[PDB]
Amino acid sequence: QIFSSKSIEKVVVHPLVLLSIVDHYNRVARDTKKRVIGVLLGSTFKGTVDVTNSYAVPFEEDDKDSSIWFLDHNYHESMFSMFRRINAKEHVVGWYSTGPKLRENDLDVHRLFSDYVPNPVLVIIDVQPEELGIPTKAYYAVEEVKENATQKSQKVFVHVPSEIAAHEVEEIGVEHLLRDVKDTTISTLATEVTGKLGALKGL
Amino acid sequence: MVLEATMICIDNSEWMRNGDYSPNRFQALSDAVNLICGAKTQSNPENTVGILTMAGKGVRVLVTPTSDLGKILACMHGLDIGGEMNLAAGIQVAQLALKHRQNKKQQQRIIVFAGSPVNYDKKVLEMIGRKLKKNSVALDVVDFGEDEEGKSEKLEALVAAVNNNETSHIVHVPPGGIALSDVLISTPIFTG
Amino acid sequence: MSALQYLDTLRSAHPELGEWYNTLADLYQKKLWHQLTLELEKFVALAVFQAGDALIQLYHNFITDFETKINLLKLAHFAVIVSRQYAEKEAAIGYLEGVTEKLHATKENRIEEPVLYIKMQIALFKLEQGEQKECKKLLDNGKTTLDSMTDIDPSVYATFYWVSSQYHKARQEFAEFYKNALLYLAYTSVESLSESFKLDLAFDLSLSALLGENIYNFGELLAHPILKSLLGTKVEWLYYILQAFNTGDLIRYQELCNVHKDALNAQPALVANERKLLEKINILCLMEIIFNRPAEDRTIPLKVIAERTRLSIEDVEYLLMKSLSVHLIEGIIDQMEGTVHVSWVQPRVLGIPQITSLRDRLDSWLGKVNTALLSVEAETPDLVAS
């Protein structure tokens, strides 16, 4: 009866978030291997995190000392107030990271951020995806008490399912963007055989 | 006015619980930190002020830089004083917290409050100051309390290792009934 | 009466610690309380003063002044160390109740952790008095309090699981002692303990696991270094018995018992429960037997189970339905040919050789996938070009 914090069952990531994050990475990290960090805004319902909007939150991390990471809260709380004014329905839900892999300081970022949300979600988005799949991977910190006595309670990020769905307006905009490429005349089999074959390449 | 990112490296060791300073050393330091936050915010609304505790079970960052004076006051009111200050680890985590930057254009300034004797080798302080010099982080050292022989020399050596175009100063506050805030007001810390 | 005068009197009493008393007095005059608590932790850890009432008077005349400024968990630790030194347990219980009432009067948001700590020490003290029902009530209340608060000091978990363990030991509940003390060794660092208590706790935990009903996972037990601390002692026989249990070797356990008949006779707990651990080791032999087989041959005749278990048809079936009923296993058994269709397979305990075997298997299935993909690619050209 200790886990009264509603476990995060799934996270739904919508396009606008990904587009904003990609533009942030381009503006801040087009020609550098620096990662770009930000804050995720939205509503959580029945264990599902609706990540509606996100905004750029400038980030530095020393290329020599990974433990050191320049992010500040002034603009963070200012934008909380300003956006919530604009849209009172939304509230902060998480912080996103633009990169292929986690880093240890992601844990302290999560710790500092959880002061704003009791259940924050860390989403890693690969700005340049090479694998065939969803470019987003969701995480939330869990205090795992290892059965070994000599180690204190360590907070470990636990993967949560992440999904991509687009609102009717976002779906409209996406198809308007994707007409020059996308395929709707594919007879369902071509799609299913392709997906099975890709899965075989996976397993 | 210059945009500055300041992290107030607050000690939480025993040597602020002495009643000799003002009515209480810890209360005087809390008032001084609040006044410093107010002055820095008044200089520019964009200024960032952070808080760190050197002593205890380990150096903990209570409030990484922020301008919400409410958060700063709340965290100062909820402080559990104690421990032996870790000046080396304290300054390392102070660099960790001054690289807590939204606006990359702001400057890095460390304000160090030294109330307890420094049991740290000169060499370690010198290497830490040289790392700060490489990182271009300004360091302000506030030496307060009873002046035990050796603490002042170590602090001055660290300041010299960090001194860069007179951007780092050392302030020695003699023990007395004079409030810490009054002395800090006249120091170059506020004038910039 | 001034605390400084008390410190001077004790300094006169014990010149050997005059320097430490001078440091303490300097901290007091300089109103230095927390590093004073650290030096006091060192002072109490020095077992020199563990014999005498000097520390009781020290608390009464010194720490009452710092109750409002010292971390509450450290205050609880000092109060418990003091309570341990009272010859009369009822007086210590009253003292603990008084300090809990003072902490409640303090009215802080963190009173619950040290208060739970002290309450659990009081419950342990009544356990030493045998008042089991009050101990159980306090344990339930402590569970409730732990549930309501998070981010607790791990020492609180450690001490609570310690006292609950002793509770279940007095209750002779080997299973719940085993679980709670495993939680303890999940929370309480080994290096902090003395080897004597390490051996004692290892002995008790191994005995509980042997007698802990429904507990068959000896891998974790075997893994913890407390048992490695048993190596080189008079109780290596018990570690060997545990290894035989984990290996399901009925014969191995047989000569282990035969060699150590005296030692097993030296402990009445094992003598009376012969049937129970006999059944347990039979079942472990059965589970490792099924483990040896692949998942493609989870049908096994009852006869082979008998010879491996040396145990009769009716009793083999009894053991099977028992280890299927306990949710240890899931499966079906066919009597007509006398075969056991287990849907029972586990996943753990293997080494470098099984890693190399999985290497061979993964190379094999990579080849299978390769031939499938090559068949697809050879079929495509005549068919996608139309």
**DSSP letter for each residue of A32-82:** S----EEEEEEEEETTEEEEEEEEEE--EE-SS-TT-EE--SHHHHHHHHH
The number of beta carbons lying within 10 Å of the beta carbon of residue B42 is 9
Chain C CB within 8 Å of residue A111 CB? no
Which among A57, A62, A73 has CB closest to B66? A73
In a domain, A124, yes or no: yes
DSSP string covering A139-200 = EEEEEE--S-TTS--EEEEEEE-EEE---HHHHHHHHHHHTTT--S---HHHHHHHHHHHHH
Q: Read off the amino acid at residue A25.
A: Y
Contacts of B104 in chain A (CB under 8 A): 58, 60, 70
* C182 contacts on A by Cβ (under 8 Å): 147
In a domain, B11, yes or no: yes
Burial class from Cβ neighbours inside 10 Å (0-12, 13-18, 19+) for residue C377 reads exposed
Chain C residues whose beta carbon lies within 8 Å of the beta carbon of residue B17: 31-34, 69
CB contact under 8 A, A68 and B96: yes
Name subunits touching C (3+ CB pairs < 8 A): A, B
Q: Is B5 on the interface with A (CB under 8 A)?
A: yes
- Domain total for chain A? 1
User: What is the 3 state secondary structure string of A14-27?
Assistant: CHHHHHHHHHHHHH
CB contact (8 A) between residue C186 and residue A147: yes
Question: C3-342 has which CATH code?
Answer: 1.25.40.570
Buried b (16+ CB within 10 A) or exposed e, C113-136: bbbbbbbbbbbbbbbeeeeeeebe
Reading the block at residue C364, the tokens are 């094999």
3-state SS string for chain B:
CCCEEEEEEECCCHHHCCCCCCCCHHHHHHHHHHHHHHHHHHHCCCCEEEEEECCCCCCEEEEEEECCHHHHHHHHHCCCCCCCCCHHHHHHHHHHHHCCCCCCCCEEEEEEEECCCCCCCHHHHHHHHHHHHHHCCEEEEEEECCCCCCHHHHHHHHHHHHCCCCCCEEEEECCCCCCHHHHHHHCHHHHC
Query: Quick check: is B192 in a domain?
Result: no
Report the C-alpha gap between A160 and C57 in whole angstroms.
Answer: 56
Q: How many domains does chain B have?
A: 1
Burial C222-248 (b: 16+ CB within 10 A, else e): bebbbbebbeeeebebbbebbbbbbeb
Looking at the domain assignment, is residue B191 inside a domain? no
Is B84 in contact with B13 (CB distance < 8 Å)? yes
Task: Among C24, C27, C29, C34, pick the best mutation site for testing chain B contact (most B Cβ within 10 A).
Answer: C34
How far is residue C35's CA from residue C71's CA, in Å, rounded to a whole number? 11
Q: Is residue B163 part of a domain?
A: yes
CATH number assigned to the domain comprising residue A135: 3.40.140.10
**DSSP structure class, residue A97:** E
- Cα–Cα dist A42/A51, whole Å: 5
d(CA B110, CA B131): 13
Distance from CA of B137 to the nearest CA of C (A): 31
Cβ–Cβ < 8 Å for C331, C284: no
Residue A148 is part of which domain span? 10-178
CB nearest A145 (choices: C186, C369, C372): C186
- Experimental structure resolution, Å: 3.3
Answer whether residue A202 is part of any domain. no
- B64: in domain: yes
A contacts of C376 (beta carbons < 8 Å): 197
- Assigned token pair, A151: 């180690």
